[PDB]
Design an enzyme around this catalytic site. Structure first.
Site, PDB file in Angstrom:
ATOM      1  N   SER A  41       0.835  -1.198   0.000  1.00 29.83           N
ATOM      2  CA  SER A  41       0.000   0.000   0.000  1.00 29.83           C
ATOM      3  C   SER A  41       0.874   1.255   0.000  1.00 29.83           C
ATOM      4  CB  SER A  41      -0.914  -0.005   1.231  1.00 29.83           C
ATOM      5  OG  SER A  41      -1.797   1.103   1.221  1.00 29.83           O
ATOM      6  N   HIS A 154      10.799 -13.911   9.008  1.00 34.49           N
ATOM      7  CA  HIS A 154       9.785 -14.874   8.574  1.00 34.49           C
ATOM      8  C   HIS A 154       9.949 -16.139   9.408  1.00 34.49           C
ATOM      9  CE1 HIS A 154       9.034 -12.157   5.393  1.00 34.49           C
ATOM     10  NE2 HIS A 154       8.639 -13.020   4.476  1.00 34.49           N
ATOM     11  N   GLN A 162      16.377 -14.537   5.354  1.00 40.95           N
ATOM     12  CA  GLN A 162      14.946 -14.749   5.301  1.00 40.95           C
ATOM     13  C   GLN A 162      14.525 -16.131   4.845  1.00 40.95           C
ATOM     14  OE1 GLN A 162      11.922 -12.670   2.658  1.00 40.95           O
ATOM     15  NE2 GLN A 162      11.916 -11.277   4.417  1.00 40.95           N
ATOM     16  N   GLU A 163      15.155 -16.672   3.807  1.00 41.01           N
ATOM     17  CA  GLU A 163      14.755 -17.999   3.342  1.00 41.01           C
ATOM     18  C   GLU A 163      15.802 -18.756   2.536  1.00 41.01           C
ATOM     19  OE1 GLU A 163      11.838 -16.025   0.618  1.00 41.01           O
ATOM     20  OE2 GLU A 163      11.831 -17.980  -0.412  1.00 41.01           O
ATOM     21  N   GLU A 204       4.747 -19.160   2.712  1.00 38.77           N
ATOM     22  CA  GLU A 204       5.285 -19.804   1.517  1.00 38.77           C
ATOM     23  C   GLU A 204       5.047 -21.307   1.570  1.00 38.77           C
ATOM     24  OE1 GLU A 204       7.295 -15.898   1.318  1.00 38.77           O
ATOM     25  OE2 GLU A 204       6.483 -17.250   2.848  1.00 38.77           O
ATOM     26  N   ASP A 241      17.485 -16.149  -0.056  1.00 41.75           N
ATOM     27  CA  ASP A 241      16.989 -14.785  -0.066  1.00 41.75           C
ATOM     28  C   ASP A 241      17.459 -14.221   1.269  1.00 41.75           C
ATOM     29  OD1 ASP A 241      13.705 -13.137  -0.007  1.00 41.75           O
ATOM     30  OD2 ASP A 241      15.761 -12.386  -0.084  1.00 41.75           O
ATOM     31  N   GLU A 287      19.725 -13.632  -3.152  1.00 32.66           N
ATOM     32  CA  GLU A 287      18.769 -12.549  -3.374  1.00 32.66           C
ATOM     33  C   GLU A 287      18.924 -11.446  -2.328  1.00 32.66           C
ATOM     34  OE1 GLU A 287      14.541 -13.711  -3.975  1.00 32.66           O
ATOM     35  OE2 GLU A 287      14.073 -11.939  -2.773  1.00 32.66           O
ATOM     36  N   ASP A 314      15.648  -7.850  -5.514  1.00 33.75           N
ATOM     37  CA  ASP A 314      14.215  -7.760  -5.245  1.00 33.75           C
ATOM     38  C   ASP A 314      13.934  -6.360  -4.714  1.00 33.75           C
ATOM     39  OD1 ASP A 314      11.913  -9.399  -2.877  1.00 33.75           O
ATOM     40  OD2 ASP A 314      11.585  -7.914  -4.456  1.00 33.75           O
ATOM     41  N   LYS A 339       7.766  -9.007  -9.793  1.00 28.90           N
ATOM     42  CA  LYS A 339       6.529  -9.174  -9.060  1.00 28.90           C
ATOM     43  C   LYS A 339       5.478  -8.409  -9.816  1.00 28.90           C
ATOM     44  CE  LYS A 339       8.905  -9.890  -4.708  1.00 28.90           C
ATOM     45  NZ  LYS A 339       8.875  -9.791  -3.225  1.00 28.90           N
ATOM     46  N   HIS A 367       6.113 -14.791  -6.673  1.00 28.09           N
ATOM     47  CA  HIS A 367       4.839 -14.811  -5.980  1.00 28.09           C
ATOM     48  C   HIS A 367       4.940 -13.839  -4.816  1.00 28.09           C
ATOM     49  CE1 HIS A 367       6.228 -17.696  -2.544  1.00 28.09           C
ATOM     50  NE2 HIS A 367       7.235 -16.977  -3.005  1.00 28.09           N
ATOM     51  N   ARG A 368       3.836 -13.679  -4.099  1.00 28.42           N
ATOM     52  CA  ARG A 368       3.786 -12.808  -2.932  1.00 28.42           C
ATOM     53  C   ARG A 368       3.346 -13.678  -1.756  1.00 28.42           C
ATOM     54  NH1 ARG A 368       4.494  -8.726  -2.056  1.00 28.42           N
ATOM     55  NH2 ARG A 368       4.509  -6.806  -3.297  1.00 28.42           N
ATOM     56  N   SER A 369       3.402 -13.154  -0.538  1.00 28.06           N
ATOM     57  CA  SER A 369       2.995 -13.943   0.620  1.00 28.06           C
ATOM     58  C   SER A 369       1.496 -14.278   0.570  1.00 28.06           C
ATOM     59  CB  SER A 369       3.339 -13.198   1.915  1.00 28.06           C
ATOM     60  OG  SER A 369       2.738 -11.917   1.953  1.00 28.06           O
ATOM     61  N   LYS A 390      10.111 -18.416  -8.853  1.00 25.27           N
ATOM     62  CA  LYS A 390      10.175 -18.518  -7.399  1.00 25.27           C
ATOM     63  C   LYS A 390       8.729 -18.369  -6.934  1.00 25.27           C
ATOM     64  CE  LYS A 390      11.118 -15.447  -3.570  1.00 25.27           C
ATOM     65  NZ  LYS A 390      12.065 -14.543  -2.874  1.00 25.27           N
TER      66      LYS A 390
HETATM   67 MG   LIG Z   1      12.865 -12.382  -0.570  1.00 28.48          MG
END
Ligand SMILES: [Mg+2]
Ligand SMILES: [Mg+2]
Lengths: 431, 431
Positions: A41, A154, A162-163, A204, A241, A287, A314, A339, A367-369, A390
């Site tokens: 937003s 996350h 993060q991942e 995810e 990432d 990433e 990203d 994205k 993708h997004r969450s 991804k």
């Molecule tokens: Mg990421």
């Protein structure tokens, strides 16, 4: 072929948050439904979604505003157009909004229409979406970046990054790769429950066990690969990432590995860290390894590792072709994460993918969450012969629906279907 | 229009395990795709799910045999039929199989075809699926049975029962009901995170917070109900799945509340406990209260509670039209869970639902541990005017998809749509 109806409605995403859905109808009877994923937003260079902000309703996360925009403003502006003029329609919606953020109408409103329209057209012409988007020469199935271990924010463990993701590059086809990632995903879940770690899943759909360090993240993943029956060398490789902006301190000017407990590090130290991790592990992609503003640091990271490691941007580029060219010139990174809801329309998305390609960069559709059953990004991956994707772990339909869709594409593609695996990193000179 | 093609392929479900998918095409181009769900486990009386049992591929969970059955046996048998001949087609496949548990061709193979055909026919007739299946008078949106807290075997905490759910009976329309449960689902998540508890989700997209008390689960929800701004007992009644068979002493005739530690309890007093719980908390429905065999016991429970509380039997009847009838004679319940794949065909499914209605029982069409983006059970609920549905929490698309479909259905219905809330419990004398 002329659009005779564009109707939006409010629905829920995989996280229980409202989002928009748009249905386009042509006079012939052709139908198209576009579902939009959770974007942002707010963002300086990022397209913005339109939320109601009604504290009393859905915690202010409703999208009744965007829906109204589609049905009363966008609809009558688009009705009359030929469903096939993707470019012209997106151009209009962009001018109708009149702002770069797409803040007036809402990026979610514009995108739902853009996607519904395209799907409506594919349907009208009776062709699969990927052929309608990229032409006749759309056959390279993406090599997937599968989320398996989660950390940073996350997660609630000792892993700064993060991942951690696995990439089944040694498979002969997407179908086998999918099988490869699924067997590893399960072998691992087994190792965790038997090790006493949590097995529940996140957004995810991956695991967020309470490992002790960052190394214990890669290492445990290596175990799963080997238990699954595959060799960490050629069958499965590693991708991560870092999302360094998370553990980066603007004031201190350094990166602080709280979770890990390794204290704070300098950008020079971080680049060194990645060099250590890459020698100790089969890591092929990193990433956002440095803060979204460390333009200078990314350049150095790219110089030292860019020859044999994919450096994805990203938060660095925010799907903004503007920032992308800035990096391309300065020579930072060598792959961009795309994205869709972040850019706004399908034609802008494709323009980005092409600009990236022309720079010898890679375009990882993402993708997004908060996702939905929509699997449009899978067709996009194949329509642009992107080479990678991804879209989540091997859990939750919000993730599996994209993989099932790639199966169908590979299936209906027949003997012309292709899976490049490791040969997908055309951006990596050395091996 | 004549069925020209029946083709199946191996895809993945929401848990990452392979499942079957079938596509049906008719001469004139009508199309239909059916996706088959799968349960965590299975036993007798339940239609057979055909697994390859090849330990070196998907943990022996591949459905390549079933895929072959549809393509090599079923396809040849059904092609030629008029897509609109549901009963005839489902009867043809049943005979083709020959066995009473569909174990030869496989219930996953048969169902996939069953659903594909019906959807292909709705497509052909250009009418919504709920109308094609149940006729013109289909307008009752189901009162959802939403998963919030998990226990028993589906968790690593106390709470003897394995599932607590909320039911937005006070909302005026399904749309609002969905919003209601959504705000509660999130309000809860706020509470759990605050008191340091697992925010991660399970297969159904619910929460598995480590709590030490069955009563805790009930009261922890009561506050999420209120903090979300709703009045319990009026806006959000409660439903629970005991799955008592899980904690039933095989040897002796008692229930061991091991998880909660309350120790041993006998079927004669367990009724008092359930009678207790319902006294303090707003429990409207208790699923599988006693052991799947303690019939005599269930009967008693039905007398003392079955007039103001819904007693749905899951394991008790296991979607078996034969078991059901028996239960109807003894008067040992007043509601049955409907699991499409547990029975195998849409016809047998609708037969089971109609047989419940005639006995004054409720037919709760439910989801399954392993799901897909398919939302056919959504249309089934409206097609039969069931009045209730148990398709998950408000996380994960394998769940949300069903809810979005219901939103779409209500919308399409417009001014004739109906949502009975509490009055959906026609099986209860008192409210
Ligand atoms: Mg990421
Ligand atoms: Mg049960």
């Amino acid at each position: 072929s002329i659009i005779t109806d564009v109707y939006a409605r409010e629905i829920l995403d995989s996280r229980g948050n409202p989002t928009i859905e748009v249905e386009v109808y042509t006079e012939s009877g052709a139908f198209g439904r576009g579902m939009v994923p959770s974007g942002a937003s707010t963002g300086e260079y990022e397209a913005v979604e339109l939320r109601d902000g009604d504290k009393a309703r859905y915690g202010g996360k409703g999208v009744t505003k965007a829906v109204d925009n589609v049905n009363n403003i966008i609809a009558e502006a688009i009705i009359g157009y030929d469903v096939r003029d993707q470019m012209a329609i997106d151009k209009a919606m962009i001018a109708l909004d009149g702002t770069p953020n797409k803040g007036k109408l809402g990026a979610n409103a514009i995108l739902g229409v853009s996607i519904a329209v395209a799907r409506a057209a594919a349907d009208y012409l009776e062709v699969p979406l990927y052929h309608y988007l990229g032409g006749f020469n759309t056959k390279v199935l993406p090599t997937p970046m599968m989320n398996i271990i989660n950390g940073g924010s996350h997660a609630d463990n000792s892993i700064d990054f993060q991942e951690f993701m696995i990439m089944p590059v040694g498979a002969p086809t997407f179908k086998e790769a999918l099988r490869m990632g699924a067997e590893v995903f399960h072998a691992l879940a087994a190792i965790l429950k038997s090790r006493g770690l949590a097995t529940s899943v996140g957004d995810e759909g991956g695991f967020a066990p309470n490992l002790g360090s960052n190394e214990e993240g890669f290492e445990v993943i290596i175990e799963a690969i080997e238990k699954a029956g595959y060799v960490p060398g050629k069958d499965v490789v590693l991708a991560m990432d870092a999302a360094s902006s998370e553990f980066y301190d603007k004031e201190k000017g350094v990166y602080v590995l709280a979770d890990s407990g390794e204290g704070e590090k300098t950008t020079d130290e971080m680049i060194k860290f990645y060099e250590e991790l890459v020698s100790k592990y089969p890591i092929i992609s990193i990433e956002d390894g440095l803060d979204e503003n460390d333009w200078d640091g990314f350049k150095k990271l790219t110089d030292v590792l860019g020859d044999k490691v994919q450096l994805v941007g990203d938060d660095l580029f925010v799907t903004n072709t503007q920032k992308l060219s800035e990096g391309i010139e300065k020579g930072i990174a060598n792959s961009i994460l795309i994205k869709v809801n972040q850019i706004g329309t399908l034609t802008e998305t494709f323009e980005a993918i092409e600009m990236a390609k022309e720079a010898g960069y890679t375009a990882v559709v993402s993708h997004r969450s908060g996702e939905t059953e929509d699997s449009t990004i899978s067709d996009i991956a194949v329509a642009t012969n992107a080479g990678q994707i991804k879209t989540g772990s091997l859990s939750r339909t919000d993730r599996i629906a994209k993989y099932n869709q790639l199966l169908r594409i590979e299936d209906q593609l027949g003997e012309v279907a292709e899976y490049k695996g490791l040969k997908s990193f055309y951006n990596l000179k050395a091996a």
